[PDB]
Amino acid sequence: PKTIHIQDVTLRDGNQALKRPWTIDEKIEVFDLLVELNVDGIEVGFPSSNETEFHTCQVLSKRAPKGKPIAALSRANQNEIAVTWEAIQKADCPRMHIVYPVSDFSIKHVLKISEKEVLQKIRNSISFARSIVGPGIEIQFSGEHFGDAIENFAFTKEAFLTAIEAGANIINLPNTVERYRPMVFVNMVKEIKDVVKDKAIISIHTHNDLGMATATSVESVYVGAEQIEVALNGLGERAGNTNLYETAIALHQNGENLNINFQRIYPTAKRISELTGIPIGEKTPIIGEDIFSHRSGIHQTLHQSKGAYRTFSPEFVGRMDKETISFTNQSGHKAIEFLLHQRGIQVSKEGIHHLFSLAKSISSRENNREITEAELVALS
Amino acid sequence: PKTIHIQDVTLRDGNQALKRPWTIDEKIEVFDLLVELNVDGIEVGFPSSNETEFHTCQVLSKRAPKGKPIAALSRANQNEIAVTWEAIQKADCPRMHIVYPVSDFSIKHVLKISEKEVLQKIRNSISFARSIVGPGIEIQFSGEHFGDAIENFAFTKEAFLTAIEAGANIINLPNTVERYRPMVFVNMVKEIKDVVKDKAIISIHTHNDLGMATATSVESVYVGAEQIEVALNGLGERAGNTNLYETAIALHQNGENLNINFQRIYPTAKRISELTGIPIGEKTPIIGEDIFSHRSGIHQTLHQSKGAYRTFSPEFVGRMDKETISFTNQSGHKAIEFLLHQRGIQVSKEGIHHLFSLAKSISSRENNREITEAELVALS
Ligand SMILES: CC(C)[C@@](O)(CC(=O)O)C(=O)O
Ligand SMILES: CC(C)[C@@](O)(CC(=O)O)C(=O)O
Ligand SMILES: [Zn+2]
Ligand SMILES: [Zn+2]
């Protein structure tokens, strides 16, 4: 079976894009939620950014449970690398994450250096990281804008093999800006997989500009990706990172083994919503308030709908099932009829509709008021 | 080049799942928005449901522009078929849409009949539809739960060829409940494509239970799907239908030709939000309020961010670009420095930070108050 690690980047990619970034105590609460959700690793921040972020990464490193990878992001730069290692040093399993651009556009118009020079910068920074962290420590290299490395794709293969030769244990392939379609990205992941083989773990990091981040991450698993970077509530740059809940559930539904505590999803998402001030849309997959409604057919059974029209049960993600029938809720004519059928009581069309009005007259004269089966049986 | 028709089902699949379904005047407004958005076809409702829906389908049929396909949904049943035709009869281009289940589960546990009997029901209803609509009229057949026809997939091929032989011009393949992953569904679309060839148009209809409806619809185009059924604002059953805006933009970005007026997307979505009472989440792709922010780096240029980190411009979908720099907005130290650099005015670190405070003291003493470049230059 495939081993699939869920790597959370809410505290870095998510936090950086927030209108009001989190205080240390809010970060600690989010961290604890990630631990209890049982993600496989946590990126705690970008410690070289400022003193506060640095401190927070130190606190979170020491708080982390034993055996849990703790990543921190750094640019391909010696001083930043050193600062980053200083911040996560005390974690049981620290993981150094270094990023550098690899797309044709980036190399041509942003960095403005030759491809052989990019390879030097990659080798030097990874090699330097290895020299300060020592032999056992995981090093992750991300090629920024990998998703847009269309015209220079072959170069990309050399960049990643260079990073691996210099000491990278994980190759992270970001769809930094979502521009095309899942299978364009996935074909690129597969080709990297084909040259990387078992020399390094392939990790995927996708953004949601065209609403296909989940599908992109999910499909990447099936060409050899073993780590997926995600965020709680789809937080992150612009439209966000790959949504943790959607990806987790999708993979579970396809028969994959994940360590995630799925029953923590809804209470986690609810609290993240409070901490960000961003409401959960009522039609959001998994956690949306209204997604378990089957109200079509009120226009002319519930057990059949719940059976045939649900991917998973609401309790699976830690929600209570609302969807129940009522005697006073409009269409409760069907409910009363079915009840009377069960007890073997014969009543015509007029009597059913008459009983429905009688039930509402007792309901709307009681505070909130619900009509029990026994008393509705008694009303005949 | 691929011809790709965008078929809107907001008035049927979207409306049926709404807490408060739309009145006729609200349906008319939505209809007009779809016409102006320039979708390739519109499903106006399920006219056999009740008298009001029937009337609305008639009104919308007569209102429809010439050359615009107007679909209405019916079950595989003679009387319903007849009623449906009566409702859309007066449209310039009426399209009959008939649905019947084809999944192993449906056949075994819901319908509880043999596979040869399912084929009879499909042949009889389509053949009957053809006999009442006449030769020129488009007939669409949907095999409900096609996405879950895993174990009986080969039967599915016979069901669709049966429907085609009986008179169906369009074969619609729904992912009624999203259960697996895009490429499982897409491989199934491809195999149907392989047996259907040019005998019928392949149409796709996906739901969003696992957040992969957009990717599923998009990827289906690349194995021969020529029609995609979508809804405005991702309305529809449960988590919703394929989002029109995401699919349209994704396909355009992949170099496909669509007839959609992309610059109408944002004002349309805003009005749909008002009519449903469902807010647009600030991180929703395309139309979300906050998706064009590049505020990472305030933690320590805007033109570079907008260039390298945007799939498309906000104006492309009819939004105004907010993202601009200010002299009094915190980090306006960089703005003042850059301004002073431009005018060739030399000022030290303290003077820049001093000028920032001076600017805010004039701003927060003016109603809303903005500091012009000329007056900030004058303050030196
Ligand atoms: C660091 C990298 C994985 C990044 O998150 C970029 C960034 O936000 O620094 C990406 O989406 O490409
Ligand atoms: C009619 C059909 C295309 C359907 O919309 C089912 C329905 O809502 O009647 C689907 O998602 O399978
Ligand atoms: Zn990112
Ligand atoms: Zn549907």
Coordinates of N, CA, C and O and ligand atoms in Angstrom, one line a residue, chain A residues 12-13 16 43 46 73 97 99 140 142-145 172 174-177 205-207 229 237 241, chain B residues 296 309, ligand 1:
Chain A
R12 N 2.2 28.7 8.1 CA 3.2 29.4 7.3 C 2.4 30.0 6.1 O 2.2 31.2 6.1
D13 N 2.0 29.2 5.2 CA 1.3 29.6 4.0 C 0.0 30.3 4.3 O -0.4 31.3 3.8
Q16 N 0.5 33.7 6.7 CA 1.1 34.8 5.9 C 0.1 35.6 5.0 O 0.3 36.8 4.7
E43 N 4.6 22.6 9.3 CA 5.5 23.7 9.0 C 5.1 24.8 10.0 O 3.9 25.2 10.0
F46 N 8.1 30.9 9.1 CA 9.2 31.4 8.2 C 10.1 32.2 9.2 O 9.9 33.4 9.2
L73 N 10.4 27.2 6.8 CA 10.8 27.7 5.5 C 11.9 28.7 5.5 O 11.9 29.6 6.3
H97 N 13.3 23.4 5.2 CA 12.6 23.5 4.0 C 13.2 24.8 3.3 O 13.1 25.9 3.8
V99 N 13.5 26.9 -0.5 CA 12.8 27.1 -1.7 C 13.6 28.0 -2.6 O 14.4 28.8 -2.2
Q140 N 14.0 19.4 2.9 CA 13.1 19.5 1.8 C 13.5 20.7 0.8 O 13.7 21.8 1.3
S142 N 11.9 22.9 -2.4 CA 10.8 23.2 -3.3 C 11.3 24.0 -4.4 O 12.1 25.0 -4.3
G143 N 10.9 23.6 -5.6 CA 11.2 24.4 -6.8 C 10.0 25.3 -7.1 O 9.0 24.9 -7.6
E144 N 10.1 26.6 -6.7 CA 9.0 27.5 -6.8 C 8.6 27.7 -8.2 O 9.4 27.8 -9.1
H145 N 7.3 27.7 -8.5 CA 6.7 27.9 -9.8 C 6.9 26.7 -10.7 O 6.9 26.8 -11.9
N172 N 9.9 18.9 -3.2 CA 8.5 19.4 -3.1 C 8.2 20.1 -4.4 O 9.0 20.9 -4.9
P174 N 5.7 22.5 -6.2 CA 4.6 23.4 -6.0 C 3.9 23.8 -7.3 O 4.6 24.1 -8.3
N175 N 2.6 23.8 -7.2 CA 1.8 24.6 -8.2 C 1.5 25.9 -7.6 O 0.3 26.2 -7.1
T176 N 2.5 26.8 -7.6 CA 2.5 28.0 -6.9 C 1.3 28.9 -7.3 O 0.7 29.5 -6.4
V177 N 1.1 29.0 -8.6 CA -0.1 29.6 -9.1 C -0.8 28.6 -10.0 O -0.1 28.0 -10.9
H205 N 2.5 20.5 -3.5 CA 2.1 21.7 -2.9 C 1.3 22.5 -3.9 O 1.9 23.2 -4.7
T206 N 0.0 22.5 -3.8 CA -0.8 23.2 -4.9 C -1.7 24.3 -4.3 O -2.1 24.2 -3.2
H207 N -1.9 25.4 -5.1 CA -2.8 26.4 -4.8 C -4.0 26.4 -5.6 O -4.1 25.6 -6.6
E229 N 1.1 18.7 0.8 CA 1.1 19.9 1.7 C -0.3 20.6 1.6 O -0.8 20.8 0.5
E237 N -2.1 31.5 0.4 CA -2.1 32.5 -0.7 C -3.3 32.5 -1.6 O -3.6 31.5 -2.2
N241 N -4.3 27.3 -0.2 CA -3.7 26.0 -0.4 C -4.7 24.9 -0.5 O -5.9 25.1 -0.2
Chain B
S296 N 1.6 38.8 1.9 CA 2.8 38.2 2.4 C 4.0 39.1 2.1 O 4.0 39.6 0.9
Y309 N 2.3 36.2 -9.8 CA 1.4 35.5 -8.9 C -0.1 35.6 -9.2 O -0.9 35.4 -8.3
Ligands
LIG1 C1 7.6 27.9 -0.5 C2 6.6 27.4 -1.6 C3 6.2 26.0 -1.4 C4 5.4 28.4 -1.9 O1 4.5 28.3 -0.8 C5 5.8 29.8 -2.1 C6 5.7 30.8 -0.9 O2 4.6 31.1 -0.5 O3 6.8 31.3 -0.3 C7 4.7 28.0 -3.2 O4 3.3 28.0 -3.2 O5 5.3 27.9 -4.2

